[PDB]
Amino acid sequence: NSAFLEPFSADVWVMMFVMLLIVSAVAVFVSFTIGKAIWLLWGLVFNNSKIMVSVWAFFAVIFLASYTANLAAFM
């Protein structure tokens, strides 16, 4: 007979984390509640105010499918 993290190049993780932090800040503006907000963001990241969450979910889905195809291709 590490490709999973390789496809992201660790940049995608940081970018998605910062963008999820800004989106969670916008959602929080809209203690454990923030943790549940990040839980929602990461929940969308793995594919398990309303409009922003919907668009964020769509972008997360597209990103997930793209990540899957690129990870399969790279593997």
Partner: peptide
Amino acid sequence: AGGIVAGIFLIFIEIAYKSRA
């Protein structure tokens, strides 16, 4: 980021319209 900023502006305009109604 741009979509989030414009999304916040669109949400602000929509909320202001709903508040005006």
